[PDB]
């Protein structure tokens, strides 16, 4: 029963850097180096170095040159993750270590610990009710309404519609950074019901204890 | 740095058919190479090590081959579970180097996007703002251009996108795309467009508004 436990995710400032861990486990934790990847949305997977418990330190890749400089404890069986700049870091780091003794490829993997980078304080967020132009109902049998989000910080929050009664024609889109995560969400009925039918969508920051219930109604 | 090239960033697929992804090494990586799979919010997993030898709990239905510059994973038959993402990586010399990634997605019927817009809200453009959104969903292909025109002229900048992957119920495609300006720009214009381009129609998808026009 390999295992490796990853450290909870953490929200640095654009500036100073923090130590992640993983904490081995099911294994003698000096016989096997320790490594970790990076996975950034738009760049891939990147390896970044590996670590001897036993002892051979480390070798870094050269794109994480300084920004990288890996570190382990034996004694506890946890290894650590550094990250010093950060700011171009945000991403999740993965633990990894390989199988066999001769392939290189990673076997076991860790959970995962994703970092963000912002200087932006926790912030409720502003939900805004998106309705078809001058009420109506559309133009044909189906009426689109929607909630705008944005503002917020950190992730997540959670939306639904009138409670979760209506969860059918829903399309809930993940939240895109701008200083205050903003996100949307649409709904689609059919259009004699509504307003006919009232439409609320429901909007939770946790961090911030915040709720917001904002009904959807015809406009001009 | 020796470079894993996965051509695909995406492959169409079917329950119960074959598939097979390819890679592509810059150089002669003998037989140092392995294939992972990962599905959203995990960790990836290992399927092939060495090449072509499947790890331990690794389904018959994969397989990989290759030994050289080019690699390739094939599953003999798809099944629901294997619709992620599959990464190539080297471990013959330093730096390890990951492949790009290939995402295995179901194909269907074309469908055509629905796409609705939005004006900036009253509540929003008393705090001085001023976003616009356009909704387009339930698409297939994946396949979509967007583009926002304001008075005519194609608009760039404060343009944010947001997309969901394929629906795992009807196997379709949805996106968001919020034009957000600040209240004193957007008063300052008069026609605001979103533009959708999907091989579904010769025509480009239009909806538009006319700022204080019903």
């Known amino acids: 029963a390999v295992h490796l436990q990853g450290t909870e995710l953490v929200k640095p400032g654009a500036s100073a850097g923090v130590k992640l861990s993983c904490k081995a486990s099911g294994y003698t934790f000096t016989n096997y180096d320790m490594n970790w990847v990076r996975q950034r949305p738009e760049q891939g997977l990147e390896w970044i170095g590996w670590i001897f418990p036993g002892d051979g330190s480390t070798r870094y890749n050269e794109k994480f040159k300084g920004k990288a400089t890996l570190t382990t404890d034996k004694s506890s069986s946890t290894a650590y993750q550094l990250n010093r700049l950060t700011s171009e870091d945000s991403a999740v780091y993965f633990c990894?270590?390989?199988?066999?003794?001769?392939?290189?490829?990673?076997?076991?993997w860790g959970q995962g610990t994703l970092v963000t980078v912002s200087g932006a304080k926790t912030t409720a967020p502003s939900v805004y009710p998106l309705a078809p132009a001058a009420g109506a109902a559309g133009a044909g049998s189906s009426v689109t309404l929607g909630c705008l989000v944005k503002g917020y910080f950190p992730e997540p929050v959670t939306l639904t519609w009138n409670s979760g009664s209506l969860s059918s024609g829903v399309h809930t889109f993940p939240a895109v950074l701008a200083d205050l995560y903003t996100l949307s969400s649409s709904v689609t009925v059919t259009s004699s019901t509504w307003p006919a039918e009232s439409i609320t969508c429901n909007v939770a920051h946790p961090a911030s204890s915040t709720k917001v219930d904002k009904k959807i109604e015809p406009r001009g | 740095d020796i470079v894993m090239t996965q051509s695909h960033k995406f492959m169409s697929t079917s329950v119960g058919d074959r598939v097979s992804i390819t890679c592509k090494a810059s150089?002669?990586?003998?037989?140092?190479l392995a294939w992972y799979q990962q599905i959203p919010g995990q960790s990836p997993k290992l399927l092939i090590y060495?090449?072509?030898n499947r790890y331990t709990g690794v389904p018959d239905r994969f397989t990989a081959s290759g030994s050289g510059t080019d690699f390739t994973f094939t599953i003999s038959s798809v099944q629901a579970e294997d619709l992620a993402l599959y990464y190539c990586?080297?471990?013959?010399?330093?730096?390890?180097?990951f492949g790009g990634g290939t995402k295995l997605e179901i194909k269907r019927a074309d469908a055509a996007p629905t796409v609705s817009i939005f004006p900036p809200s009253s509540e929003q453009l008393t705090s001085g703002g001023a976003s616009v959104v356009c909704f387009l969903n339930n698409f297939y292909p994946k396949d979509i251009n967007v583009k926002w025109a304001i008075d005519g002229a194609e608009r760039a900048g404060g343009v944010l996108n947001s997309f969901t992957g394929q629906d795992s119920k009807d196997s379709t495609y949805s996106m968001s795309s919020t034009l957000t300006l600040t209240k004193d720009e957007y008063e300052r214009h008069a026609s605001y467009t979103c533009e959708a381009t999907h091989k579904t129609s010769t025509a480009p998808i239009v909806k538009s508004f006319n700022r204080g026009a019903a």
């Open positions: 060495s090449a072509s």
């Open positions: 990894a270590r390989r199988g066999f003794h001769g392939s290189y490829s990673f076997a076991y």
């Open positions: 150089q002669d990586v003998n037989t140092a």
């Open positions: 990586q080297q471990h013959y010399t330093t730096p390890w180097t």
